[PDB]
Design a protein around this ligand. Structure first.
Ligand SMILES: O=C(O)c1cnn(-c2cccc(NS(=O)(=O)c3ccccc3)c2)c1C1CC1
Length: 288
């Protein structure tokens, strides 16, 4: 597309912001607020529509985990509710295959989900698929070659370095090589033939390290670390580069946006969000 959308997040409380960053000119635009504040959500795009999935409204007068799917049309600058998921999923991961949205893991109160469900926009309907082999919240999700990957997270007792892969035509999950780092609340995306995992929390510290999984060799390799340690970051890809947005560095809710160039193996600061926040949903689509 053309713009990087950041939706929701957390600073003091869950947020309703929708803001769009244009890498071509450095500008930010504030767009229509989410109908309900939410942090720990995920964003994705299907058919030029932006979707906000799951999360939690951490608010002065209560905390409510979200089963919501909400749809933002850039042409109209309007959010509309879509069909809700079977269960609330805070600290969710999502991935898109063949025009379908996969909602992965997340929490509902003390329940840590292994369940996974798939949304078909053409029918505005969710259906459960096979659950993961592991309960995962703060799970990173990516798609490569029409296979779905769930990476890291927290199973209710331990943060994880494990990862697994979903093969849709077999409706089956299989473990892949674990990462070399325990990561929960990392940013996970795909670039070229690799699954990247950036940042996260390992049980003791927020991380700046970044590693990538080559599906052909089944090995993880570290690349250059980010300039800022961060957990609960947003991540997306735009014209062959990775963008990481916000997060928590153990001291500050970051407004920093960093950009990774894989040809030079370097990170640089490219912009700042209008305010520091963590737990955003991020996706890329046309400008409004
Ligand atoms: O600790 C873990 O293992 C774990 C599992 N999922 N997430 C996760 C993932 C996404 C969002 C949030 N929430 S947030 O409101 O953005 C928030 C983050 C940091 C501090 C205060 C609020 C949390 C985490 C933490 C991030 C590390």
């Amino acid at each position: 597309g053309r713009l990087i959308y950041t939706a929701g997040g957390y600073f003091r409380q869950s947020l309703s912001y929708l803001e769009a960053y244009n890498p071509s000119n450095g500008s930010w635009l504030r767009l229509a607020d989410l109908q309900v504040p939410r942090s720990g959500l995920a964003g994705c795009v299907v058919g030029g529509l932006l979707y906000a999935v799951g999360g939690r409204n951490n608010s002065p007068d209560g905390n409510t985990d979200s089963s919501a799917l909400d749809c933002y049309n850039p042409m109209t600058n309007q959010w509309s509710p879509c069909a809700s998921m079977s269960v609330p999923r805070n600290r969710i991961g999502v991935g898109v295959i063949d025009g379908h949205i996969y909602a992965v893991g997340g929490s509902h109160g003390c329940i840590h989900h292994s369940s996974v469900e798939r949304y078909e926009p053409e029918r505005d309907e969710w259906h459960l698929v096979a659950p993961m082999l592991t309960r995962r919240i703060g799970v990173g999700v990516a798609v490569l070659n029409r296979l779905l990957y769930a990476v890291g997270g927290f199973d209710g007792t331990n943060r994880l370095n494990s990862a697994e892969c979903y093969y849709p035509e077999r409706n089956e999950w299989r473990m892949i090589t674990p990462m070399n780092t325990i990561r929960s609340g990392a940013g996970v995306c795909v670039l070229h033939n690799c699954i990247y995992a950036a940042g996260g929390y390992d049980g003791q510290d927020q991380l700046n390290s970044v590693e990538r999984y080559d599906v052909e060799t089944e090995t993880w390799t570290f690349v250059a670390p980010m300039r800022h340690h961060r957990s609960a970051l947003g991540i997306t890809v735009h014209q062959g580069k990775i963008y990481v947005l916000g997060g928590y560095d153990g001291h500050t809710f970051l407004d920093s946006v960093e950009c990774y160039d894989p040809d030079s193996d370097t990170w640089s600061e490219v912009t700042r969000m209008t305010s520091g926040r963590s737990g955003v949903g991020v996706a890329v689509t046309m400008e409004p």
